[PDB]
Amino acid sequence: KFMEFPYVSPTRKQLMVDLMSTVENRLQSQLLPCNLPPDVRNFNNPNGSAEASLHIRSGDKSSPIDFVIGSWIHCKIPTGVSLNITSISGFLNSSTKAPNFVVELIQSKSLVLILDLPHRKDLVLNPDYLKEYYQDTALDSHRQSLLKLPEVNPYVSPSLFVRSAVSPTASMLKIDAEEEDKLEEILRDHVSPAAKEVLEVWLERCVKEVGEEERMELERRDKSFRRKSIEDDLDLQFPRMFGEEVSSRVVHAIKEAFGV
Amino acid sequence: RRKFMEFPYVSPTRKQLMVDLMSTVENRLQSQLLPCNLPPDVRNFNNPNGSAEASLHIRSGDKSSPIDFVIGSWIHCKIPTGVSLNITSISGFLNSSTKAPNFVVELIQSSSKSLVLILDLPHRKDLVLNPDYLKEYYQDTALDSHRQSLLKLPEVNPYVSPSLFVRSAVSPTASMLKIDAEEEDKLEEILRDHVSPAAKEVLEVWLERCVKEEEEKIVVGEEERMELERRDKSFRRKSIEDDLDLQFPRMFGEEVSSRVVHAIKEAFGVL
Ligand SMILES: C=CC1=C(C)/C(=C/C2=NC(=C3\c4[nH]c(Cc5[nH]c(C=O)c(C)c5CC)c(C)c4C(=O)[C@@H]3C(=O)OC)/[C@@H](CCC(=O)O)[C@@H]2C)NC1=O
Ligand code: NA
Ligand code: NA
C-alpha cells in the first residue's frame, strides 16, 4: 500500500498522509481514479534491494489539473544504509498558467527537503506572474523561517536544471541534526506546517479560479521539464535500483502519464 | 568632479578590481565598441546638496556588433543614518543578434558590516524550455566552480536578494555572495586573492564564449530573435523601475535624475 509509508518515521509518514489526503479530498471532483496497472503501483527489484509505491491520479480534462503523483522509494544501498524518498507533486495542464506543486523528502539525522510551487511561465518575461503567484503570497517566508534553524542550511542541487526549474521562493534545504529526535522535532513543528501552507497556497491561488499561443508555450515548456527530469532522474537510476525489467514497465507508465 | 575610473570612496583593492575589469572589457572589445558620447553632466553628476555623487560610463556596440552596450557606474550616497552606500558595477549587454548570456559584476556596500558581490552571466533564454542553452553556457563552462570556491571562505556566505526578480534573472551558477567586512585587512585579501581572479575568469568566459569574435553568425532565427528582444526589453524595463525610478530622484533630486535616467533609458532602448 502507498499510504502505509513503511520505511520512514511516524512523523514523516504522518506528514505524507496528511498532504496526500488534503490533495485527494480538495480535488475529489476533478481527480480520476488511479489507472496504473497493479505492477506499477507497487513494485520491487527481484533481488530485494529496492521497493517502491506509485500513486497517480489524472485530472479531468475540463479541470485545471493534469495529474497528481505521490511516491515513496526505498533502496537498500549495498553499503547497508537505506535511501528513502517520499514525494507528492501536482501538475497543472495548459488550460491554466498557474504554478505546479512539489514536496520531496530525501533521506539517508540528515535530510534534504525540496518544497516549492514551480513556475510555468518565464519570470523575467512575465514579472506580473512573479508578483501574482510569489510576491503576493508570502511563499518566501517558509524558506526563511526554516533557514533560521541552526541545523537547516541551503541545499544547492548538483543539477543546474533543478536549480532553474524551481521558483525563486523554493525551499531547497539540507537538514543536519545532531541526533534522530532533533530532526523529528524539526519535521513536525517546522517542515510540516510549512508544507501544509504551501499546499494551501497551491489549492487556493493556483488551482482555483486563455491566450492561444500562451497555451502552446505552456505545453512545450511543461513537456521540456518532464522529459528532461525523466532523462536525468529515471533513465539511469531506476534500472539501477529495480532492474531493467521492472524499470521498463514503470518508466513507460510514468512517461505515458507525463505525456512524454 | 570625480571621474568614472577614479572610483572614489572605496578601498584600494575594490578600485583596482573595477579598474582591471573595465580596462579588460574595453581593451578586449576594441573592434566592437563606439566611444562614449554621454554629455559631461551625465558622465559625472551629484545631488546639488552634496548627499550623493555618481559617475556613468556607457559604450554602445557598433551596428554590426553582438554588443548592445557595456555600462560602468559608481554611486556614493550619504544615508541619513550616517552610514554610506557605495555601489560599483560593470555590465555587458548583448543584442538580439546573438542568444548568448549577458555579463554583470556588482559590489554593493550599505553598511560597515558586509560587502555584497553579484557576479554572473545572466541567461537570455528560458532554461527550462531550453535545456540545450543551459548545457552550452553553464554546464559546459566552469561558471559554478567560482561560486563554490568563494563560498568555501569562512567570511563568505550566500546573499539572498530581497528582490524575487533579481533571483529569477540571475543564472543557476551566479555568485550571489555576502562578504564579512568588519576586518578591513581580511576583506582586502578576499578581494585581491579570490574575488578578483573569479570575476576576471567569469569575464573571460563571457568574452570568449558569449561575445565570441568567431563566425559572427548564427543568424538568429525569426522566432528566437523576437523572443530575445521581448525578454531583454522586459528585464530592462523592470530593472530600471525597481532600482532607478524609485531611487535616483531620491538620491540626486528630480533635475539630475530625469536627465540621467533618460540617458540610461536611451542606452537600454526603453526610449
Ligand atoms: C544583470 C544586471 C544587473 C543585476 C542582475 C543587478 C542586481 C542587483 N542590483 C541591485 C541594485 C542596484 N544596481 C544598481 C546599478 C544600476 N542598475 C541599473 C539597472 O538595473 C543601472 C542602469 C545601474 C547604474 C547605472 C543600483 C543603483 C542598485 C540598487 O540600488 C540596488 C541595490 O542593491 O540596493 C541597495 C540589487 C537589487 C535588489 C537587491 O537589493 O538585492 C541586485 C543585487 N543589477 C544589475 O545591473
Ligand atoms: Na540555518
Ligand atoms: Na563560507
Swiss-Prot record, chain B:
Additional comment: The absence of light completely suppresses cell death in acd2 mutants.
Associated pathway: Porphyrin-containing compound metabolism; chlorophyll degradation
Keyword Coiled coil included in the entry's annotation: yes
Protein name listed in UniProt: Red chlorophyll catabolite reductase, chloroplastic
Site (described: Important for stereospecificity of the product): V170
Source species of the chain: Arabidopsis thaliana
GO terms classed as biological process: chlorophyll catabolic process; defense response to other organism; regulation of plant-type hypersensitive response; regulation of programmed cell death
EC nos: 1.3.7.12
Primary location: plastid
Gene responsible for this protein: RCCR
Protein role: Catalyzes the key reaction of chlorophyll catabolism, porphyrin macrocycle cleavage of pheophorbide a (pheide a) to a primary fluorescent catabolite (pFCC). Works in a two-step reaction with pheophorbide a oxygenase (PaO) by reducing the C20/C1 double bond of the intermediate, RCC. Belongs to the chlorophyll catabolic enzymes (CCEs).
Part of the intact protein present: 49 to 319 of 319
